[PDB]
Ligand binder design. Sequence first.
Ligand code: 3PE
Ligand code: LMT
Ligand code: GTP
Ligand code: MG
Lengths: 98, 82, 48, 52, 63, 320, 347
Amino acid sequence: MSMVYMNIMMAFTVSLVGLLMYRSHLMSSLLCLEGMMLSLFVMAALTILNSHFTLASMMPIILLVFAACEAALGLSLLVMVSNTYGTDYVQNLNLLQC
Amino acid sequence: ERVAAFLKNVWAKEPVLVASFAIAGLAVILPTLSPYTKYSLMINRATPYNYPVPLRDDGNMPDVPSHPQDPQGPSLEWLKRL
Amino acid sequence: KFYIQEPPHGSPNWLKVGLTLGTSVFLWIYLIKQHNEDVLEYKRRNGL
Amino acid sequence: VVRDHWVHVLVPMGFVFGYYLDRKNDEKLTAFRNKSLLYKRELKPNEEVTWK
Amino acid sequence: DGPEKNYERTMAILQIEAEKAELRLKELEVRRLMRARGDGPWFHYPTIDKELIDHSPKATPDN
Amino acid sequence: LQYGPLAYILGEKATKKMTEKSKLITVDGNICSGKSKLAKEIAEKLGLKHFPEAGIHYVDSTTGDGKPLPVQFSGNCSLEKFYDDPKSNDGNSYRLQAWLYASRLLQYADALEHLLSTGQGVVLERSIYSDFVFLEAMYRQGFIRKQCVDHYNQVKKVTICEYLPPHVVVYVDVPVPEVQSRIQKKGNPHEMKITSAYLQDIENAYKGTFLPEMSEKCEVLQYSAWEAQDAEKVVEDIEYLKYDKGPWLDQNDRKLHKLRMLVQDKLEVLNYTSIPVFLPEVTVGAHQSDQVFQEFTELPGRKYRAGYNEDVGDKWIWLK
Amino acid sequence: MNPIIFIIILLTIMLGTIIVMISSHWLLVWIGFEMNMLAIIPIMMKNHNPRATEASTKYFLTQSTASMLLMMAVIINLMFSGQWTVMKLFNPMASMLMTMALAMKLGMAPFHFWVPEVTQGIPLSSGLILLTWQKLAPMSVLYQIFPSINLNLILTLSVLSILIGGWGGLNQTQLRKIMAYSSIAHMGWMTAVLPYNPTMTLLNLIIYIIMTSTMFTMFMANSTTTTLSLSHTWNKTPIMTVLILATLLSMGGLPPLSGFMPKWMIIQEMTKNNSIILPTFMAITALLNLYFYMRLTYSTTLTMFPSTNNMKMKWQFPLMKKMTFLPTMVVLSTMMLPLTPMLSVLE
Ligand SMILES: CCCCCCCCCCCCCCCCCC(=O)OC[C@H](COP(=O)(O)OCCN)OC(=O)CCCCCCCCCCCCCCCCC
Ligand SMILES: CCCCCCCCCCCCO[C@@H]1O[C@H](CO)[C@@H](O[C@H]2O[C@H](CO)[C@@H](O)[C@H](O)[C@H]2O)[C@H](O)[C@H]1O
Ligand SMILES: Nc1nc2c(ncn2[C@@H]2O[C@H](COP(=O)(O)OP(=O)(O)OP(=O)(O)O)[C@@H](O)[C@H]2O)c(=O)[nH]1
Ligand SMILES: [Mg+2]
């Protein structure tokens, strides 16, 4: 494939690894989720734009809309996690082992 | 009577929301009552973004013109008068 | 014995009883006429 | 019919009903009635089927 | 039951079970062929419907 | 419609039935402190429903024909046995206290259901909020083990959290020496065996823990023995309360609907009163449980759901 | 939650699932999953406690991750075919990513860790939706993409799910965690037969849903969530202990109950394709599921556990729970084996 795809696919993989390798802050992982969607938007936009798939030009826009619904949903849960424990640390969410 | 009693109250307390709903209602309603709405679609149709590919004259298309200045084909006289 | 609080089902709910019996009757008639319709259509299509 | 002796028809009826159903099964398995090489014959003047 | 009835009832039973047995074997071989060759009503995985294509003259000629 | 989400959607919202007179009032005090009389008079004057203090046979009064059931259908817990032998080996002391709390929890749910569904306030004599004083008195006198207290707290912490405290807490402060004389006049031979130290422990819990807690969230009125002798003066105080604190200010139709769905479902109310915690005082073997349960279903009008018992004259069973 | 808001949110959970099942376009399939995930989270948080918050968070992180892998597969598929039709995929890398994406959505092993925890952290009514309705959409996608799925991958997931589900349930006393590991074990049977006969995947899915709905409804009827709390049922409602016994023996796959039907039809399809070792391994490993079903029947129906004195108060009140469809569901869960040939309706 064209060389641009090497870096966009690489960017998606970097964010996927960033998502799967947690640290403490839950906000940091939510950012990696937003980054994953950004690479998908760009990767989809390139294909659609380059192939002149006219009606598919709206598809990346629709992608962003449900990205915001996910980010808003993620932030809502972060608020509740923060209220319970006073931090957004993911090590506090370990009550359900038992 | 309650039609005016409720309306007067909201005019006094939240005229901003009264104006908002009145304007939104007109947007929904007037397009279906206006006699000029039908020309909006005709003007959009008459705009030639694309080339008008000619048809192979096969010997029996009386309604189709041979030249752009022939009497056949749609006309825009209505558009000059709008 | 004679209840201190009147039971919720102390008396029949006649509106439900009518609906329940009316539905059973209706469904039964619908089923039978369908079966008769299918039997006649089946004989018609197979030259019987 | 008594108030003490109506439950005593259930099993006897079940046997009679099962007996009846058993014979109806034989009505579905007459493809070879009077057609086997071993027992195929001619019907008697009044007979309609060798077995029913 | 007399021996004749049971004898010929058995032949009726064997005919049905033999016919069913042959169909069971035939269905396994038909399924094997249909799946391998894709030339029958079974294992007919959908392809894109061609009535979706627009054949009208396009904005440009070479397409 | 039986109450539920559908009834709520159609307009059955508590804010429509509640008024300034829809109040939950609890009269509390020591034994033989005049609670019953004062509670009954407050209820009659204000137009509220009076609930006599929940006893062993409270649940019987709300089901069946309303009569008390034989004592085996309450575990054989006995108040008289508690007074005679408060250290009974058979665990009667705590078994009674656990039973009484559950009876009060049920009475509180019934009271709340009445308040929410009709808007008429109610008057209670003690409640789940004040029942613990008797548990503290029992423990300080050695009548129950510490394990029983731990069990009691577990049951309370998962049940009391679900309800709203009473609007008004009326308290009659009668000092112990006067209480002992009152018991001596009352004449119940078992009740005369109460030690004063036990009575003082009831008072120490009331003054030490109950009232300081209720003050934060309820209107609390304390009346000496004589002040309580005129309910008309008590009613006058209740009628002019501010009602400026507590969780009732924070309630809305959405919350009172959820609360009403709980209290009308009595098995849901009583869910955690039988947590599988095996104390000897409240654990029952399978053979005993099976036998008593079978006997219970052989009682008049108890074999089937209410309204389906033909042994007591229910009709149209085949259409119900 | 306002009752009207609860109904609107529930209908949105169903709308997202429906969109997935009726869409011919990969973008609308992805939208359906996203809409479904958005609506279910408030059902998880309905009781607002730290365990519900933890459960919803773990659920959101897992499902959101799966959707990104799902959309990655769709875009890779677009590059290598230039279309969006929901059908076989045209790139093996896309097939793997989509297959993993659906495995995480279903909670198949080794992507299973969230299922026991999320199920434990949410109420019983929400757990019922999670372990039943939420399986429909991912399975409906696997049903359409299986001709391009890697056989080794899908059978590996099925094998691991049956093992981990069976082993995981042996150590559980919490009912919601028992149902969760049971669901993992049953997911494996559905996907194991998918490469050979998708019709048998639907049958297992439908029968699993009926039996799982029956159990959850009976747990809700008595507000029981632990083994010991459920062991008091013989003293409240004896009939419910017999229904639990019949249903649990059915989930174990014992003839002549209905739950034997899917295990039986799956073994038939696998043997027709000369797969002998795998169905044998699967059937024996399902004995682990029967073991911890049998423990529940022992503590619930076939013995009488100690009771408490306060239990006597409950004798005087009737069951008020709706228990919608429970009479029908329990009969279907148990007495359906004679009608096995009706599986052709799913063909
Ligand atoms: C049809 C062809 C296909 C074949 C598949 C198999 C079909 C059977 C499917 C069964 C479906 C479940 C429904 C079973 C109905 C059981 C009825 C029953 O148990 O009696 C009710 C009674 C409940 O008690 P109660 O309502 O209070 O009555 C007064 C007594 N207290 O019960 C009790 O009081 C009993 C309490 C003690 C518990 C004893 C438990 C051992 C007996 C269990 C027998 C049922 C086993 C079912 C499992 C499948 C059997 C093949
Ligand atoms: C969770 C993982 C996160 C990382 C995700 C990274 C996604 C990257 C997607 C790249 C997709 C490339 O897909 C891969 O392209 C090459 C093209 O040479 C194909 O190559 C193969 O097929 C084509 C023709 O079919 C020919 O080149 C040849 O037969 C063979 O080399 C592979 O069959 C295909 O699988
Ligand atoms: N052990 C125990 N006894 C209780 C409990 N509640 C009530 N009692 C007893 O029930 C009996 C009646 O309670 P009281 O109302 O306080 O006594 P009274 O004679 O009626 O005096 P009044 O306040 O006027 O009603 C008393 O013997 C109490 O000790 C309880 O929770 N635990
Ligand atoms: Mg009294």
